[PDB]
Design a protein around this nucleic acid. Sequence first.
RNA 1: GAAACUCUGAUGGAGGACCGUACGGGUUAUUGAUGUGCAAAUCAUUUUUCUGAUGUAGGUAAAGGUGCGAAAGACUCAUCG
RNA 2: UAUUACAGAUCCUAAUUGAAGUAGCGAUUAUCCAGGCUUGUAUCCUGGGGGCUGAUGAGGAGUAGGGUUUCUGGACAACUUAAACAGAUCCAGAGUUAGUCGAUCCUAAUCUCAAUAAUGGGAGAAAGGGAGUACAGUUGAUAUUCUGUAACUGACAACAGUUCGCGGCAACGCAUACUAUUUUUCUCCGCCAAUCUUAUACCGUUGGUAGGGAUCUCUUUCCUACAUGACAGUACUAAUACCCAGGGAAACUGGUCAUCAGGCGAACUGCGGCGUUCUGCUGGCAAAACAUAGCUGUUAUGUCAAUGGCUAUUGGAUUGGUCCAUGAAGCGAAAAAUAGUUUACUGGUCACUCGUACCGAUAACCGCAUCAGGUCUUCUAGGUAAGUAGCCUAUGGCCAUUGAGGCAUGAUAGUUCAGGGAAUUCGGCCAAUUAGAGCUGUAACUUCGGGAUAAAGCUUGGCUCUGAUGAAAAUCAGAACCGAUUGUUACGCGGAGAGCCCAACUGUUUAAUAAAAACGUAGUGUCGCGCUGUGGUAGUAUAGCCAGUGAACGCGACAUGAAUC
RNA 3: AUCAUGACAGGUUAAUCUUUGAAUGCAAAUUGCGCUAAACUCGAUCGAGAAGCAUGGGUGUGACAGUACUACA
Lengths: 50, 237, 115, 68, 77
Amino acid sequence: AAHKTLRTKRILCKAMKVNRPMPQFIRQMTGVRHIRNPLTRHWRRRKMNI
Amino acid sequence: GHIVRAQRRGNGSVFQAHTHHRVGPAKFRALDASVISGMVKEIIHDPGRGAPLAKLIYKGFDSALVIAPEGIHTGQFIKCGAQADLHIGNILPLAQIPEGTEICNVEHRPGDGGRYGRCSGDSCRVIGHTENYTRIQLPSGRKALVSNICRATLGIVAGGGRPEKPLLKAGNVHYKYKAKRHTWPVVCGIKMNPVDHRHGGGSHQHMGAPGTVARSARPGQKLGLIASRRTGRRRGT
Amino acid sequence: VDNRYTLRRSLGFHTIRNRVAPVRTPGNKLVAHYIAKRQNGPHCAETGKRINGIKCVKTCELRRMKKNQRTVSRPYGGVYCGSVVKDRIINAFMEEEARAAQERKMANEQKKKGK
Amino acid sequence: PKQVTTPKEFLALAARSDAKWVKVKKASDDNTKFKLRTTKYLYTLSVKPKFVELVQNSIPESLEVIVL
Amino acid sequence: GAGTPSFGPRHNKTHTICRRCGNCFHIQKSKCAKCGYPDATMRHYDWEKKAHRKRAQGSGEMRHLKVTFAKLQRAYA
RNA sequence: GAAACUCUGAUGGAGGACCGUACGGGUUAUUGAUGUGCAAAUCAUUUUUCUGAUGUAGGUAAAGGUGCGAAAGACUCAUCG
RNA sequence: UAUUACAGAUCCUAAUUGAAGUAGCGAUUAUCCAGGCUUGUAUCCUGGGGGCUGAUGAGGAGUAGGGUUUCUGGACAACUUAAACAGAUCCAGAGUUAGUCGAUCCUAAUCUCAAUAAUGGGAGAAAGGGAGUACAGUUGAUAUUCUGUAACUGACAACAGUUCGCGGCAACGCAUACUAUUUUUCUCCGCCAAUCUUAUACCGUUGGUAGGGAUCUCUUUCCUACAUGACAGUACUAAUACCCAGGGAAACUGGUCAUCAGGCGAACUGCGGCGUUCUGCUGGCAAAACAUAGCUGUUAUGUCAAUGGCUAUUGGAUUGGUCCAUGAAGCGAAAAAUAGUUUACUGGUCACUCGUACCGAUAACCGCAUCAGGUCUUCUAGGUAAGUAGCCUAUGGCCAUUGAGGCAUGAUAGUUCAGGGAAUUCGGCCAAUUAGAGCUGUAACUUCGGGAUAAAGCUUGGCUCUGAUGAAAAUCAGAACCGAUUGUUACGCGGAGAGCCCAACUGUUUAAUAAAAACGUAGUGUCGCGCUGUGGUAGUAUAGCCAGUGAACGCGACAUGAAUC
RNA sequence: AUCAUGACAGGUUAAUCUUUGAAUGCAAAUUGCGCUAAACUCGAUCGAGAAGCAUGGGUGUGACAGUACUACA
């Protein structure tokens, strides 16, 4: 960046909208506990390698 | 052992000719049946080759990068053909020319391009006319039957006496082989370890083995003096 | 004062196309303005000299100019300058005149056999 | 943005059916500038206060005139 | 020498995303190391029988193929 | 000065000339500091080079009994007889 | 009937001790006082001191890479070697606007298919080529992208008005088509050195007016401000290049910093021709922007006049030197010639696609990490000085760094040490001395170029003047007088000489114990081969690749290693 | 949504079937660069979308090339 391609930009979009906390209502629905979002990361710690 | 620097020139990755600024392949026009006049548009210098080239125009204008005899000038009229007269410039077949005279860029086969006697300050001499095969002496000493129909430029090639002046500095030879190809600088075989070269190894630097090898000797093994029917100081003869 | 100024275009390096000059704005602010390229313009074949009566601008913006200012009026107007055209007239006359007089000569010489 | 010397040539440029407005504007040395807008260019006309009164009348009636 | 200081100028990318694999497509050599694109056949060897069955059928959706298993249950039961 | 030429001063700006800058290229010495490091090769002072056989970037070529090597068995992703 | 009994295998996996509240909390300028917000701040913010960075800056901006780190609001379980309301952390939302900047289009090194009824097609550069944009304003984050204002380029349409080729002896000027072929030009090209000159910055002599700072005394003072974009025009001043008309040159003349130029036509004259630069005057343009003064959004005045650079950088001009080195291609554009077909020229609509935030090492990249490492480039102020050195300071950015108290010993980085002066030690290792400039003065030996800054002496400040050279506000020389004999004052800057060995020399080398006498080199020599060949490579396709866009003054194979004898 | 005009996490079959991939209009680290008789569908004769267009080989159909063979001129 800048000067990213479009299909590069498509991946970086999907990588940041997927990065969030898990919703509250799944724990209320299924009753499971201790499920983490796997595709959470931090930009500084883990690099994507894409 | 490893593969030796003599063998590694074949595979041809870094050992290719540096052919970027070279202006074109130096040859005659194709044969195509008398006499045809041709103006020297200009004489230019191409990299690698020590001789000049002279770009002719056989006006359409058909071009031909012919290698340059000495005493050619710009807007001289060169005359390729049989019935063209003798000047330094003109391109005659070997039927027509007198014996005992110096010629340049002589062809082996007719209609070829030009083969023997091309580098700066060289010339094939003509011995004598048999019948079909005009016998000529090449710059080395060797003598060659060549057919009378095939063509040759008249006179000696330009740029003569370039090795008369030595190159004082390693830098001058760096710029010499930049135009040509990578083959320099040379590390000597004794200096290298045994795996790298045949002559290498030992506590004290020395060759050890006879250092003079057959035509039958293999790739990897042909290093040093190949099939040397004499050695040492060529005193007389 | 601080009179230092950024490059505006996103190319960083100092190539021939990316060259700048500092300029005062209306607003008292120094700023990069980019240099358009130099043009040599039409030299001649033979000798290699500058012809007169034409600007060295780009040949693309030479099209936008008037057909007047693209050329010089003579035969071989753009390509050849003046004295080289004089020489071409003199040679191409007397090459053809000698060849025409050769046809007069070979007409006149062969008539001596009849008389 | 070109300048135009002659007051006669200005009135030829005014009556082209290109021009959207003229702007009257006071200047230094007690002059004034009539800035004719065209689609391509902006034709300015500097004048002295002798012939200032006549030129405004000269301008076509249809064209809008914005005073400053 | 060969450690921390020489890690500094490591900014170029040897491999790039591959179209068929989507994973290690060699830019200079232009081949997907993992799948062999663009060779028409897809890369696998019997020495990597472990790594192959991560890629091979079953791993993905099987949209057309799962309904053709399900027919053959009904016909023989 | 008989001549062939050669004395003085300026002009000129040649050279893999010299001194010497750097967030340049190298890495001599203190066998200094550190050695539970800032660092799986660093830091300080000193030293070498600085228009070139120069440095450097991107693209591109050469692949494992091969490659490449101004040659140390060097280097080929902290790995190499 | 068996996956059947454990203390050991530097055993395997999982958890946990002592050491131990110990080692240690580094590197980076420096913190202090009063307020604000709070249960709670040296730390988060405000104000005021004191400091640092000191134009290759922790300044303003970009490639490659990272990928939301950008912005606003709320939050402190954890992290940011203590603290924390702070944060590049956590949570919730929001943000990247283009016909003109890039990509797209062209080819380079190079790679890959196809045909051989062929003479190629395609890929390959966000630093090469490449048509066209500027200013001002605005947001919490976007701007050459948005708004306002002014340009410009291309393509596709009709339509209105002009026009059916002339000027100059000449250089050339002015209003003229299209298709094709061929030819030429622009695009278009190494490195180094010198002179001249716009623009920008900076320093200057002359004044001036606006505001602010300073004041025991002195200073008609000190600081800030004094500005105009792309684009379009046509005056005469005056340049150098080149060409034209007249002119017709040795008593050779003209000319540069330098080489030089001329009967293949010099000086010289034309209110010559033409290209590129220049000065002035406008348009754009004061309506904007900025600074004062006053009124509640806007009204006032003002942004002025003169003229140098011995300073630097950039663009350009005029030239020279250097090479066994001669320093891209293609798309595209115009011109000309020769055919043929002809009337032409000037003056509404639309402009697709994708990138655009922020960092760019100083905590946003690579090193497992907010690592004293490493990694390409850009704009570059004043003084001192030869200076892009070191040292100090405006603009800009900052206090990055746990605090409170002690000070013996020791480690480490530093100044200084009576008398002696290498006695220390494997060894003058280390440190000290020397040093800049001006004027003297310089040996043996030498390949006559060097040695040489050889060595060895002297002078250097401050203040008041005088003179010379320039245009010139600069720089150089000389003399008085002055006091702690001292002065390249800090900062920065060789200790030197005399023998012997090795390698001639500039250069290269064991990334991470060896930079050397090793490697290299020029120079010298030997051997092979005249293309159906020679030295390789390559592998089943009778594939074609390297030297070879080559030809013995060459290509390949070795050995010695400048010169002298 | 309830004695049905039939709830939905049920199970089949058929539609619809984004960018890709053998990937196939030519390419590709690019949302790059093409082509088309009618019909289709909006769009008001003429634009656009929709849908077409790969290589290799088989049988048929057509066209071109040849001083290849032969007859009649």
